[PDB]
Write a protein that binds this ligand. Structure first.
Ligand SMILES: *[C@@H]1O[C@H](CO)[C@@H](O)[C@H](O)[C@H]1NC(C)=O
Ligand SMILES: *[C@@H]1O[C@H](CO)[C@@H](O)[C@H](O)[C@H]1NC(C)=O
Ligand SMILES: *[C@@H]1O[C@H](CO)[C@@H](O)[C@H](O)[C@H]1NC(C)=O
Ligand SMILES: *[C@@H]1O[C@H](CO)[C@@H](O)[C@H](O)[C@H]1NC(C)=O
Ligand SMILES: *[C@@H]1O[C@H](CO)[C@@H](O)[C@H](O)[C@H]1NC(C)=O
Ligand SMILES: *[C@@H]1O[C@H](CO)[C@@H](O)[C@H](O)[C@H]1NC(C)=O
Lengths: 424, 424, 424
């Protein structure tokens, strides 16, 4: 009886250890773990990304009118609260006299107003910004950019891909085979800053955001700055990330049928959620937001929409729920600078563009964007432990400890069935 | 006999292959492999990191005295070896006459000295550096910084979290919802550099290190530079790395009860090990090192402590053994620049701060630190092959090749036990 | 009969599920998946990488001759098509009169020419560039650099490791324990740019590429720019990547016996493939390409070799097939800037180097390269699913569902063999 009892106790301990590691692997499985696969796939044809940039000015000074104050000088830091010029201590002569010429406001008939007219006309001409465009050694045109509207205002996009245009591709690396543009930020047309404000942008330069053709730009939250007086080499590395759907990951695996973007991205969910909340509140929308809804005369931006953004970012954080898409494609960047002009390259530019050497020194940048090498990194989340390997590990453990199988369990049911006649 | 012999030879080869792949998986297991899990977890509340910065000057020139030479001009590149001014060829008039006014050294009674008095008084006032502080659009105060002492000297920290203060959080991305500070590096108060030295810092600007509230700053080895004349956008990405303990990884999994830091980090182990070695050697410690031990009058820094650092970094590399902690939180950064001021924003600053336009051109920077997006990357080392999957794979292999189990092995012992009576 | 039939149907369904998940794991196996292992290994001795830099000028102006035009002014943007000066509108006086002095071309005997003589003599002296070299606080020498030839021309390399020199190592982090060099890009010696060109480099500064001693530099496609007037801190992080051979990965696992590089890299395959294609075409090679083949008088570069590069990059993309090597070692970099000189450090430099303060303001940079910390990241592709775990999972599944083994299959063959006598 004793040796059989020892055999039985070893069977009990073996079954208990089997149950322990089996629960270990089950509890491992229902965490749905996932691991990371990195890759560096070289390829010949690479889609050159969409470049987007805003000048740090919202709008030029010479292209506003007494109209454009009289509706819109309230929000845009040009009036007082009682419709007059703010404290203009130590101002330039003609700079103040043109503004005071606009600041009569006497017997003024109003004009039927929109913010989109103002951001169209008072903004920057790209034909007065784009000095020299180059792409793969071929001269590109100012009409090849695309106008968008951001929080900064009228902004531009190269290689947008929209309006049926083919996405531009590169065939070689290096700084010569990229986008090489020469821009003039036009510091003579910046806003008068004799008023005091907490958001008074003392800086000068450009803000550039690199993004795919998929997503709309989000320059306020994603872009990087580029100063004038420097050619800026921007090394780019394409990264094709693939995430996972839930339970494993967090992907909006659907097509993402948003109201205003047929394609889906993380920024599109953001901008459409904030759009939808504002159209819910103030019956009209901001200029950087799409919609069939109208825009508002600018009292309703500082009166209605801005505190809706404040309670939206503060208290209504649950009102926007955005899942990251699966096949995201980002662009790593590496910024480096060289100074421009030289002591030899100055006088040619000054003769060429009819400006002073001071103007060339403090008003021109050269944005230079190119891939470092013709390869894209691939960051995929692989499912670490599928149901098949679960069945393999459980079956291996049950093969080791008890040695039984599902056939053995079913014949155990049949052996109980032959014992079931004794109970009845 | 033949068919049974073939069955036996196939059993032998099957057992040998089983032993081969079993040794393959065992040798795989005792390497303790581990793989990488990347994640991008979005969240609403993010702890804004601790910002720390040193001006590149060690101490202002106007706040030193004939005292401060007479003890301390030896180490601090202001005396000769025989207590006189070094070679001051092509010096400014009053700049040299004030130093020579300090350089009489005639009938000088000494003064009871410390290095901490000198770095307190001769350093930079933060109230004479911090022009405008902003955080989330709310104006922060100069009293909200914290004074620390580094190798560069008196340095400052925003959002330190110490002295029971709550760690500051952000609720939105973009450059407006971050830390926006305007600083004056005060190039008029830099050191006279008419002496020659190999460590003669010809540069000018600020050095900034971003770190968690956990670790003390290590600006000499971790910080990045920021030049004046540029608003510098600093994109930040929080990364929560989780490593593994040994055998798998290299983690000090304990609480790390260091003598001078209750919390544990890699920099704390470094600074306490170097502290402990110096308190072992020179009976007193440097200013950037904590301790209950005193400091030294500056002959003992260039006489005792510096070659202890030299043999410490060179020969005593085994005297400091620092393991990286488990749940490290780093901050990826991306630097971009825009130029400041504009041609419009100059005269307002010059009127505002009572300085020349040259002063604004070459003396002011704007440090701008913000998260790119409200998400933190997660780099975890998962154990690749635990003991449970080991038992599963071994049990699966033994289920395939020989088909036996541990029950079969124990009954093989019992079958030998029934054969054990034949031997005795 | 019924209960046996139910046992048989459960055996059929169990066998079918077994076949399903078995095909799932086989199809998983022949994808050869691989996952990523990240590591951060700290170590004392780190090999300091090879630094390479080109001035953005190809060659100095004062070191060319009427010779050097008369052969070589055609390609090098100094002649017209009919051997005369291009449009020199708004030129400096002596700058144009020296060129016109070279531009007589009257009764000119030619001179036996090479491009390597011209890039040797007309380029930049490193002894007229390297103002102050420092490494680990020890002054390095201008003879410790190494001359190479790139597309930019005569370029230099620190810590090249070639000619039997030991690779330099660092023992401490921080900006003091790295390479600290002070350079003068010499904007007075840049090319006259009164001619118009699409590749007219208006910029000024230096281009620096950090690389291992293994690979030759590829500065046109890999380097980053550094402007003058800034000390540039370059944080470096060593990364030892290990890829996999095919089928798993894409590695040239062999030694890579290229014709001109005994060691193998990705850039070596590129430069030797383009070399081999050009030696196939124009019987002589460019200067940035190695070879026993000669070089060409410069009509054959703009006549033969450049369109061979054009059809090479465009149509002959299949003519170069380069696999990435296994144990690649890259160097992550992080660029930050501080301004140099100060208002105190100017006059010492101007007295020291016999130049104006304007010269110091717009002609000197300080390249500063150092490791952030004494640790290297390790990005290894581990094989995710080897043949051993395949046998374990299949054996576990066959242990679960049918419970059979390979012994059971062989005894099934023997049971068929006992049934094989009934057929014959
Ligand atoms: C989305 O991912 C699939 C592969 O899973 C690919 O076919 C498609 O091109 C991806 N889309 C984008 C925009 O990258
Ligand atoms: C050049 O600029 C000056 C002043 O800006 C102007 O008077 C002149 O007409 C301009 N000439 C050309 C050709 O643009
Ligand atoms: C340390 O890691 C644990 C999770 O393993 C977490 O609870 C804790 O907040 C972490 N500490 C820090 C400082 O990140
Ligand atoms: C402004 O600066 C000048 C010289 O620096 C000084 O004399 C004057 O008192 C200052 N005034 C104010 C209001 O700070
Ligand atoms: C190549 O990798 C092996 C380890 O697999 C190592 O011994 C060798 O040093 C590596 N070579 C280089 C140049 O990193
Ligand atoms: C300094 O430079 C001037 C002009 O460049 C020259 O005449 C003089 O000889 C130089 N002196 C020395 C000592 O280099």
């Amino acid at each position: 009886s004793l040796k059989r009892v020892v055999w039985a106790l070893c069977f009990m301990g073996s079954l208990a250890l089997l149950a322990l590691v089996c629960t270990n692997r089950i509890q491992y499985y229902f965490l749905y773990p996932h691991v990371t696969k990195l890759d560096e796939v070289a390829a010949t044809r690479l889609t050159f990304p969409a470049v987007t940039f805003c000048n740090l000015n919202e709008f030029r000074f010479s292209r506003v009118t007494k109209n454009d104050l009289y509706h819109a000088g309230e929000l845009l830091a040009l009036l007082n609260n009682r419709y007059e010029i703010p404290d203009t201590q130590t101002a330039d002569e003609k700079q103040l006299e043109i503004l005071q010429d606009k600041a009569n406001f006497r017997n003024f008939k109003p004009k039927p107003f929109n913010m989109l007219e103002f951001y169209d006309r008072a903004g920057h001409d790209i034909r007065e910004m784009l000095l020299s465009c180059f792409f793969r050694g071929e001269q590109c045109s100012p009409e090849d950019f695309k106008v968008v509207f951001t929080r900064y205002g009228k902004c531009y996009t190269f290689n947008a891909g929209q309006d049926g245009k083919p996405r531009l591709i590169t065939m070689k690396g290096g700084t010569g085979n990229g986008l090489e543009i020469m821009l003039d930020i036009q510091q003579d047309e910046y806003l008068p800053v004799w008023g005091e404000t907490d958001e008074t942008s003392f800086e000068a330069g450009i803000k550039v955001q690199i993004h795919s053709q998929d997503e709309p730009p989000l320059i306020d939250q994603l872009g990087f700055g580029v100063a004038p007086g420097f050619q800026t080499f921007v090394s780019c590395q394409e990264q094709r990330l693939i995430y996972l759907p839930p339970p494993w990951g967090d992907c909006k695996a659907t097509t993402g049928d948003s109201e205003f973007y047929d394609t889906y991205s993380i920024t599109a969910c953001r901008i459409d959620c904030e759009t939808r909340y504002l159209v819910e509140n103030c019956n009209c929308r901001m200029v950087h937001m799409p919609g069939d809804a109208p825009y508002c005369t600018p009292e309703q931006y500082k009166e209605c929409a801005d505190p809706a953004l404040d309670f939206l970012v503060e208290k209504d954080n649950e009102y926007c729920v955005c899942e990251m898409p699966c096949n995201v494609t980002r662009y790593g960047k590496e910024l480096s600078m060289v100074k421009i002009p030289s002591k030899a390259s100055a006088k040619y530019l000054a003769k060429k563009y009819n400006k002073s050497e001071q103007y060339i020194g403090e008003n021109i940048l050269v944005l230079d964007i190119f891939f470092e090498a013709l390869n894209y990194e691939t960051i995929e989340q692989k499912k670490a432990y599928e149901v098949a390997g679960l069945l393999g590990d459980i079956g291996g453990q049950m093969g080791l400890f008890i040695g039984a199988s599902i056939l053995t369990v079913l014949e155990l049911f049949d052996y109980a069935y032959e014992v079931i006649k004794h109970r009845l």
